Each structure stands twice: as C-alpha cells, then as structure tokens.
C-alpha cells in the first residue's frame, strides 16, 4: 500500500494498492455511485464496504463525456434528493472521473466526490490536476471544472480484468514523467504486467512525478507545461483519424518526435528509450500523414527534451519541423507503423 | 455614479448610475455577449461601446435556465472559437445572469466574464455573491457554480422601461436590506420610480448591505445568513404563480410579528407601509396547515432594525403569529 500526499492548492491522499477501501474514511453524509458497467463488480464492492445504496452505471468511453449523460446523472441526484453534504463516489477510468468530477463540481454549485480508477491512465494522469469536464460537438474537453477530489483509491486488484492495450496507455504517460523529471525508473516499462509485483512502485513513483510538478507551478508557467511532452503532435494525430487512435498511443508517437526535435537541437540521444517503448507498446499503425496537411492540426511552443529532466518549451523553424517529421516518418516506416 | 468595491474572496467593481459604460475597462481580449432578448437595444448599445461583436439573444425568465439553453450557448461559443481569455458579457435580469454565469464558469473551465443588470432585483440581489446556475426538471437552481465578475455594471437608464411591478420587485429586496442593516434610508421606497434621481444613491446603499454582510461572514455562520429575512414563509407561499418580490413583502410582515412575539421593537408599521405601496396581489385563503408542509428550521427574526436572530421557533408560536398575520392582512385589504 502506497500513500501520496496532494497538498496545493487542495490537500487530498493518493493511495495505490491492494486493499484500499481499508484506507478511506467512513462516510460523514449521503452518497451516491456513478461507476463504469466494465467494473460493476468492483463498483458493488466500494459500495457494499462504505455503505452506498444510489448507484448509477454508465459505459464507459467517450460517449459518456456528453451534455446528455451530464444531464442524466445531474437529474439522478437530484431525483434521490442527495443534499449540498453528499459524496459522489466515482469507480471507474479516466471517462468517468471526468464525467463524473464535474457533476460532483456542479451538483448543487458542488458536493465532495471520491475517485477510485481502475485504468493505468486514470491513476498516472487523472489522480493529480482536477482536471474534469465533457465534450461538445465543437470539439474534445470544452466544458468542465477544475475540481479536486477528496480522496483517490486505486485498487490494483482491478486492474487485473484491464485490456492488456489500455494498460499499457497509462504506462506511456508514466514514461513521459520519467523523460519530464529525469527518473530512469519510470522509463522501465517492458517487464510491466498487470501481475508485475513490483507495479505498485512503479505506479507510485509515475503519480508522484505529476505532484511535485504540478505543486511547483500551478501557474504553468514553468514545469507544469511540460506535462504537454509529446502532446502537440499527438494532439494533431488523433485529430486526423478522428479519435479512432488512444490518446496513450498518439502521446507513444509525439514522444518520438519530441525526441527527434531535441536530437536536432544537439540533446542527448533519447531515441533508444522511446524506441523501445513503440516495440513494448505495439501502437497501431498509422494513415498516410503530409507534413502540409499537419500543420491545421499544429506562435506555437514545443515541449523539447533535451536530456531526461532538461526539457525546453519554445518554437521551432519550420524548417526544423519539416526535418524531423520526416525522420519521424522514416523512424515509424523502418517499423511497420507508417 | 457611484462605485462600489467587492473584495473578498475575489475582488471586482460594481458600478451604479447613468453612463456606465465608459466605466468599464477596454477588452483585452476577444468577447461574447449574451442577452435578454426583450433589452436588445441597450445590449447592442454594450456591443457598439466595448467593440464586441459576437451577440447571442436568449429568453429573458427561468426558461434561459435549462439545459438546452446551457448546451446550445456553449456550443454557439465553441462555434465562433473564444478562446480562454475571453469575456462574456450578460445583459439581462437575474435568470440571463444566471446561466451566462454558469457558462462562464465551465466553458473552458472557467473564462471571466461581466454583469450587466438590467432589473432593480438583478442589482440589489445578484450583483455580490457569485451564485449562479440552471434548472433541472426536478428543480430550480439545481446545477451551478460560484463564479465572480470581473465586474458588475448597472446602468440606471435601462430601468427606464422597465414594469412598476418588477421595478417595485428590487426594492423589496432593498426594504428587506435596510431592516437587516437599521438602515432607516433603505426603508423609504415609497417615493422611488424608475426616474428618481434619488434612485443611484439608494441602490448604491441596499448594494452596500450586501457586500458588508457577505465579506464579514464568508462561510455564513453569522450576519449572513440573514440575507433569508423573510423568506422561509416568502418561499413557503410560493411553493405553496406568486412572483419572489410579493412573496418576500408578505414574509417581512410575518417576520415582524414573530419579532413582536419575541420581545422585540414594533416593526409592523414600516412593513405595512411597504405592503400597501406595494400593492401586491391579494392572497386567497388560506390556513396554516396549507403552508406548514414547508415550515430545525431556523427563522430570521428582526427583533429591531439592525438587530435579528437566527433560531427555531415552537410550531405554537407560528400558528399564533399566522392568524395575526391574516388579520394584519384583512386590513390592509390583501386577504378575504
């Protein structure tokens, strides 16, 4: 069992492990459970353990980051009559901690709300920020809230029935704090099981990463906008193939590209590491991609690692760019995924 | 033109008088506004002034306050690419504050935004306290945020159109303001039309009230709380077709004589000025068990002006002071 501590600008606990339900503290008011149908039977354990009897289930994924599910859940409470002092338990992925956070930040004007991720990026991304929010037709993460949750729970014993394609997404964003924070251990990855009993550590290690940074600059002014590594081209690539491409995958190919930018900058070799993390990863291939039909998915400012822990944010020569995404292209293509 | 500063928790300005718009700070950044459909005028008067020319048109009453609304603003914002250091503006009364609000407070997480009242109520009532919301089908203000503005605007000339009964609205409110703060000024409405150049003056005061109680007790465990003066039977009346203002009116009356059951100073005689200059709608008939169902509650009680207590009451004492009350009522010709 491994305890964090998140103290700005909110103070909250982190727990990852086996047997954290042990962990939270007893419910002082009502409360309700919105939760992933994929993890139903983890689900009717927290609440079963805390005394929950309003439990909602909803599929997970995109669709549930919707004004219409909003509006079902937000008419859900009301309808139970849950008061300004109720807790809003949230069991499932990075989906639903973001559905779920910003009907806890509105409900009422907001209601404490307790996270407990059952995916690797829900506990190496969603567990520090507050970060939550849904979708518009317009585009991705338009509306929402920054809302801290009172407590995270992450139960390793649910991440066992996690597709073995989802797990590794959350590890790449681990990877990402390892290149950000200089920590050679988070860019161990390969050996990494649902199983692996060292995981817990790791896991650990990743969200402790996304504290510190997040705590020295809550202005994202400084580090804190490093968290966006690997992100500008990502961004642009799961655009183009109209989300069909995880986020975790698209972030794997942005980190290669960082990569090359910091390489053509004269910074260490980095390609290695990133190298082997795509094999590990196996991220699906690519579509046909032009440099000229990425920039309307690209005054802007990269995220540049120069070197594990020394990373750059600034803009690049067009020309720059040009290079390295062909060598991007080349890397990808000596690989089967492009 | 007066100025008022709100500081804590989050500090901005609050403008009341003619020529307001001048007042307000050039944009930074790219804008928005939203407003009430029937107060277009004075809101592309706003646009013309501050070079915004993105403008949205909504209803004006509780029917802006729904989800739909909610969502189709957002994506009318998302449409036209406002970026997060944006501004919205919002022209209207308390409902079009409400949900413009709420959309600045979530759309992008949170973009500033600044009020323009329209309604005497809007400025005595929604100008401090950053609450904002919509409406569910199982309820009013349901879904909301606090959110602050960047600053508050209230130009007097739009009060000009604006219906005696709602003008009357805000100074209820006012009223309500002055017998929470012993402020005798607040007490004299009976005077006050949308013309009166005494009105910048008196809004500005019932303004003060509010800001001095919410900045003196920000997590409402004091002087706060009395802001509900009136309103445990105003709500209970209406939950029970009649408008806020008038329910909030017949409330005061009741509140004054459970004062008097109290020990306190008689404070029917400013109550029953307030209610015959009002005119408000007469009540039909009623008893107390009618209004029980929504009566461990604890009651505003002004024992003097300026001097109120926060306590539950024997359910005894309420029945006696209800069938005053319907005295009181019946002559001034508001019942039977």
């Given at each position: 069992m491994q305890r964090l501590e998140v103290r700005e600008p909110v103070p909250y606990p982190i727990l990852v492990g086996?047997?954290?339900?042990?962990?939270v503290p007893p419910l002082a008011g009502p409360a309700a459970l919105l939760f992933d149908r994929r993890v139903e039977g983890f689900a009717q354990e927290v609440a079963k353990a805390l005394g929950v009897r309003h439990l909602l289930g909803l599929p997970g994924g995109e669709a549930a980051k919707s004004l219409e599910v909003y509006g079902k859940v937000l008419s859900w409470l009301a309808e139970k009559g849950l008061p300004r002092n109720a807790t809003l338990l949230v069991v499932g992925g990075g989906t639903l901690t973001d559905l779920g956070g910003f009907v806890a930040a509105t409900y009422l004007r907001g209601v404490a709300y307790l996270a407990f991720p059952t995916t690797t990026l829900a506990i190496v991304d969603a567990s520090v920020g507050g970060k939550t929010g849904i979708n518009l037709p317009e585009g991705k993460n338009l509306v929402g809230a920054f809302h801290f949750p009172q407590g995270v729970y992450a139960e390793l014993r649910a991440l066992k029935t996690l597709p073995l394609p989802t797990f590794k997404e959350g590890l790449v964003e681990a990877f990402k704090h390892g290149l950000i924070a200089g920590?050679?251990?988070?860019?161990?990855?390969?050996?990494?099981?649902?199983?692996?009993?060292?995981l817990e550590a790791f896991l650990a290690r990743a969200v402790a990463v996304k504290v510190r940074v997040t705590e020295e600059d809550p202005l994202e002014?400084?580090?804190?906008?490093?968290?966006?590594?690997?992100?500008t081209l990502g961004h642009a690539l799961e655009a183009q193939t109209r989300h069909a491409l995880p986020h975790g995958m698209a972030v794997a190919y942005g980190l290669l590209y960082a990569a090359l930018l910091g390489r053509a900058l004269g910074?260490?070799?980095?390609?290695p590491p990133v190298r082997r993390l795509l094999l590990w990863l196996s991220p699906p291939p690519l579509p046909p991609l032009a440099f000229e039909d990425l920039l309307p998915y690209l005054s802007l400012h990269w995220v540049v690692p120069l070197a594990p822990g020394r990373l750059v944010v600034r803009p690049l020569p067009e020309g720059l760019l040009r290079e390295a995404f062909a060598a991007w292209r080349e890397e990808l293509k000596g690989l089967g995924l492009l």
């Open positions: 086996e047997g954290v339900l042990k962990e920590d050679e251990a988070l860019l161990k990855v390969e050996d990494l099981t649902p199983q692996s009993p060292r002014k400084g580090k804190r906008r490093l968290l966006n590594l690997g992100h910074g260490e070799d980095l390609l």
